[PDB]
Design a protein around this ligand. Structure first.
Ligand SMILES: CN1/C(=C\CC2=C(NCCCCCCNC(=O)CCc3ccc(S(N)(=O)=O)cc3)/C(=C\C=C3\N(C)c4ccccc4C3(C)C)CCC2)C(C)(C)c2ccccc21
Ligand SMILES: [Hg+2]
Ligand SMILES: [Zn+2]
Length: 257
């Protein structure tokens, strides 16, 4: 089954998931000089005050911090979005080295990592139904660079020992996702897909311009995770990112002048 290695990685995905070569695949390169300021964009609203995290899971490709989405708690609205999208989970993509790891790129620049906060549209009642709709999902993409530590990330960093291998999970209640945001909410937005199989072209991407900084020791701990399950040969969880995909004359719009 799909992974990130030579034999099961991004170049192989299209065989099981034909949509890998579809018309709105993610991620993409954000060419800053081609993106246009869109004044019809309403202000973005990230409301994570009442967020209810439940647990953290190593799924053999990344780790997901999962949220209780059975009520309108953590929500994304405004910006390019109509209506209300509920936070369901977040996860990261990172590299083996600082000079790679992000999925989206900016003028071809790769960040050390990329955080994806995944939200589903509430007109569709649940996640599984949302992912059958062209406007079912909204993903908030935040770049990570290596610099000073991100305090709001350390509770995640502390728990990764508990979930080293594929299939392991740990209690992860009372996590506040607001600690992972940068100061500015300036963003690029384009219509796209999930970046892991089954891919699925149901995402409104909202990619933040301002990266967060995380410490070298924080990202180092991401890199100690395993792709394999307990009692198997060690396959370090690194370079779990899909590279940039053809834009196919979609338009990337900027929230900012
Ligand atoms: C292609 N296509 C369509 C379906 C395709 C399709 C399937 N249909 C169901 C897709 C369900 C996906 C679930 C969510 N996936 C995530 O990854 C979310 C996490 C995540 C979030 C964000 C990020 S990130 N990186 O932040 O972005 C990264 C990860 C497949 C399997 C379905 C199963 N089912 C139902 C059951 C049930 C029980 C057991 C086993 C299964 C399997 C798994 C077999 C596999 C082959 C492709 C449809 C919708 C018909 C469609 C319409 C129009 C055009 C095309 C098209
Ligand atoms: Hg879709
Ligand atoms: Zn992702």
């Amino acid at each position: 089954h799909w992974g990130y290695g030579k034999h099961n990685g991004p170049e192989h995905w299209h065989k099981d998931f034909p949509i890998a070569k579809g018309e709105r695949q993610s991620p993409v390169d954000i060419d800053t000089h081609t993106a246009k300021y869109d004044p019809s964009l309403k202000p973005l609203s990230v409301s994570y005050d009442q967020a209810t995290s439940l647990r953290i899971l190593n799924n053999g490709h990344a780790f997901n911090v999962e949220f209780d989405d059975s009520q309108d708690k953590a929500v994304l609205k405004g910006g390019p979005l109509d209506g209300t999208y509920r936070l369901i989970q977040f996860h990261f993509h990172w590299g083996s080295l600082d000079g790679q790891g992000s999925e989206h790129t900016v003028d071809k620049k790769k960040y050390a990592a990329e955080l994806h906060l995944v939200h589903w549209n509430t007109k569709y009642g649940d996640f599984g139904k949302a992912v059958q709709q062209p406007d079912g999902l909204a993903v908030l993409g935040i770049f990570l660079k290596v610099g000073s530590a991100k305090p709001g990330l350390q509770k995640v960093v502390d728990v990764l020992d508990s979930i080293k291998t594929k299939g392991k999970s740990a209690d992860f209640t009372n996590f506040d996702p607001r600690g992972l945001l940068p100061e500015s909410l300036d963003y690029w937005t384009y219509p796209g897909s999930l970046t892991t199989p089954p891919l699925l072209e149901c995402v409104t991407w909202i990619v933040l311009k301002e990266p967060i900084s995380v410490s070298s020791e924080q990202v180092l701990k991401f890199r100690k995770l395993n792709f394999n399950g307990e009692g198997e040969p060690e396959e370090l969880m690194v370079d779990n990112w899909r590279p940039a995909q053809p834009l196919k004359n979609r338009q990337i719009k900027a929230s900012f002048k």
